[PDB]
């Protein structure tokens, strides 16, 4: 009965029999939207433009029309599909903006020679205006939302070494889809910019917004609440940052990817800043002994060039002797099933692989290229990269990691740049590029 009106008081017209059928199921969401004061809303986007968007060339009438204009384009739009797409996006405002963006208005130098030492040990390879106008908006988010947003990247070390330059804020959120939408609705009403929310397939749970000219504004990685806990965190300026110890461990697993090497090729000094800021954190934080002398670390990483499975020896550190590291995640997931395994430990983005200790054997997937020293000889950084990976698991399950790290660190001091003889090839990740585009009323996944 009221569905009849609900749908009519929404479309700015009389609901057609065709429409009354489809929309009928959204009688509650369309109502909850109509009954939603579409004004105090205009009061909040404004009570933001002046708090994080001062430098904005637009009258408070634009950041008032754009709004109301969207909120009633059901009248102009008669297409059944574009409605469903404008109905699910309007709803993201009516229920989360408040709890999401609304709330928004209520040392290392002494290790430079160290990162310097190491980076070169491995040296063997071969953006809109809002970008900045936004980072300011996010600094607040990190505070206002401690448990629905964790930070890392460059900006994380910045809260550590106020000398670690940041021009982007990388974060993890247990709701980054609700998050990213509201902010794209923000960058719109205020700027008038038509941002595009795109989702990259070869990346586990990833969505990023960009501007009309295809320029990266801000991205985000998503994680289960589950994962949001086991992720080692550190509290700073009222914001949790992915503990610098973990972040650093994940950087050895970084240089194992040929690319990063090629990145550090054309700027061997780039990571000195970030990398030392970190070898300086661990040295203190967990009194790490730094001396060229520290063997037993580069573990016997016999690689089987056929089954694409590096075989790592960890027996001298963990109860589980080996740890079959796979290179093809589609395979591992299958073999694991054959093991009748039902609870492999997944941490999503954080590790980009799952871990299964089935019978003293740990099975896992390496998400980068395996660098070699020679023909079937797993290059040193790759041997450390793999190793570093295994240790990420420990940190997420609160186990033995301390010492191994040390041994791992020292292995990288004062070494002979072993060239890149060759490397393995990443497994292809399926999927299609998905995306939401408010303007054209387009949602595809």
């Amino acid at each position: 009965n009221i569905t009849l009106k609900i749908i009519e008081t929404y479309l700015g017209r009389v609901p057609s029999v065709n429409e009354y059928h489809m929309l009928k199921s959204q009688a509650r969401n369309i109502q909850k939207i109509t009954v939603f004061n579409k004004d105090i809303f205009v009061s909040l986007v404004k009570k933001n433009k002046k708090r994080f968007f001062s430098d904005v060339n637009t009258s408070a009438s634009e950041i008032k029309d754009r709004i109301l204009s969207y909120f009633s384009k059901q009248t102009q739009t008669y297409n059944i599909g574009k409605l469903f797409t404008i109905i699910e996006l309007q709803s993201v405002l009516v229920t989360t903006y408040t709890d999401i963006l609304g709330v928004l208005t209520i040392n290392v130098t002494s290790m430079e020679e160290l990162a310097r030492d190491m980076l070169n040990s491995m040296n063997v390879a071969v953006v809109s205006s809002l970008v900045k106008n936004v980072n300011k908006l996010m600094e607040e988010y990190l505070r206002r939302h401690n448990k629905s947003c964790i930070c890392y990247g460059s900006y994380s070390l910045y809260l550590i070494n106020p000398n670690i330059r940041y021009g982007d804020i990388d974060i993890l959120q247990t709701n980054s889809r609700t998050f990213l939408i509201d902010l794209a609705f923000l960058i719109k009403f205020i700027t008038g910019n038509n941002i595009i929310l795109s989702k990259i397939p070869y990346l586990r749970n990833y969505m990023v917004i960009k501007d009309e000219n295809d320029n990266h504004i801000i991205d985000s990685f998503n994680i289960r609440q589950d994962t949001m806990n086991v992720v080692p965190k550190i509290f700073i300026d009222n914001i949790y940052i992915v503990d610098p110890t973990f972040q650093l461990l994940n950087m050895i697993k970084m240089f194992s990817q040929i690319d990063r090497l090629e990145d550090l090729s054309k700027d061997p000094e780039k990571f000195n800043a970030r990398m030392a800021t970190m070898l300086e954190y661990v040295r203190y934080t967990h009194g790490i002994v730094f001396d060229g002398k520290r063997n037993n670390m580069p573990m016997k990483c016999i690689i089987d060039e056929n089954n694409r499975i590096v075989t790592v020896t960890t027996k001298d550190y963990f109860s589980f002797k080996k740890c079959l590291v796979y290179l093809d995640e589609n395979v591992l997931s299958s073999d694991i099933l054959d093991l009748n395994a039902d609870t492999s430990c997944d941490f999503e983005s954080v590790t980009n692989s799952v871990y299964l200790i089935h019978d003293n054997i740990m099975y896992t997937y390496f998400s980068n290229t395996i660098l070699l020293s020679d023909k079937g000889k797993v290059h040193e950084i790759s041997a450390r990269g793999l190793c570093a990976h295994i240790l990420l698991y420990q940190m997420l399950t609160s186990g033995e990691y301390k010492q191994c790290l040390s041994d791992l660190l020292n292995s990288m001091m004062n070494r002979d740049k072993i060239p890149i003889y060759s490397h393995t090839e990443r497994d292809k990740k399926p999927g299609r590029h998905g995306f939401i585009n408010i303007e054209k009323d387009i949602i595809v996944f």
């Binding site: 889809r177 397939p201 749970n205 589950d226 589609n330 997931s333 054959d338 997944d346 998905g434 996944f445």
Partner: protein, 288 residues
């Protein structure tokens, strides 16, 4: 009396330790909704756990009315997981599925022609197939072959990254010919008919490397034997060492499935979550 002190339920067919001779002499409202919802949560949760379910499309062939699917649709939505749902069945679906932007509903009968048509449409997004084609009484051994036949085609045309199909071996006494079915683990089903051999063939592919396994009549016999055991002797026990409101084997079996399901909410123990989930599922289906 007739109780038992198990360590874990039989999750896969392979795990059945005994067997008994099929003796021809052989509940809860909405069980054949529970059997399905509990198997698809397990499967798709398993996927999500190995990151295959991430932003992929789940195609369903033989999904009507598939009331339960609404629940599945919602469980995952709430979990932040982004999925495209495509349900195709010769017949119509339960209206609760209409109006979902993330759910497309085809109402036609499939075949070669069509499978080649949707793959074109869906590409390059990965596909996750869930086959439950049907052919009341008992389907004929000839229909089982014709069905398992088709399902293998869905696999070739669609080239799915992972699949979940029906698998009930033809009765030895009613054998016709042999055949091949995808390589996969035969997942046993909770709250399934008292004397059903039907299981779920969960399989994860590697693309360029397909694998089938020849089913024979020798095999068909070990199917009837082991399954009839599971049904007559196993699912009739009481897990005395299972600390849970219900101790009937299935409840103990359904426990082990959900424990592997993710929920963003927080709970003191697992028993706390399983009991929550169950409590929710049995709620949606309307089981007291």
């Amino acid at each position: 009396m007739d109780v038992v002190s198990l360590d874990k339920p039989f999750m896969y067919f392979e795990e059945i330790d005994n067997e008994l001779d099929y003796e021809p002499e052989s509940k809860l409202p909405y069980q054949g909704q529970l059997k399905l919802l509990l198997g698809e949560l397990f499967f798709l949760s398993k996927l999500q756990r190995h990151g295959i379910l991430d932003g992929a499309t789940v195609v369903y062939i033989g999904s009507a009315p598939g009331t339960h699917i609404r629940y599945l649709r919602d469980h995952f939505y709430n979990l932040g997981v982004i999925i495209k749902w495509m349900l195709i069945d010769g017949r119509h679906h339960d209206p609760i599925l209409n109006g979902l932007r993330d759910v497309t509903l085809v109402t036609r009968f499939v075949d070669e022609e069509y499978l080649r048509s949707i793959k074109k449409q869906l590409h390059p997004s990965k596909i996750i197939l869930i086959s439950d084609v049907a052919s009341g009484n008992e389907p004929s051994t000839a229909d089982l072959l014709s069905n398992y036949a088709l399902q293998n085609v869905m696999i070739s045309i669609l080239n799915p990254v992972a699949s979940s199909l029906k698998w009930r071996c033809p009765f030895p006494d009613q054998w016709i010919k042999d055949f091949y079915i995808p390589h996969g683990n035969k997942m046993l089903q909770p709250f399934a008919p008292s004397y059903s051999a039907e299981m779920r063939l969960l399989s994860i592919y590697t693309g360029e490397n397909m694998r089938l396994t020849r089913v024979t009549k020798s095999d068909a016999v070990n199917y009837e034997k082991k399954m009839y055991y599971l049904n007559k002797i196993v699912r009739n026990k009481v897990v005395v060492n299972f600390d849970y409101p219900n101790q009937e084997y299935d409840y103990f079996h359904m426990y082990f499935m959900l424990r592997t399901v993710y929920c963003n909410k927080t709970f003191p123990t697992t028993k706390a979550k399983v009991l929550f989930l169950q409590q929710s599922i049995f709620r949606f289906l309307n089981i007291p």
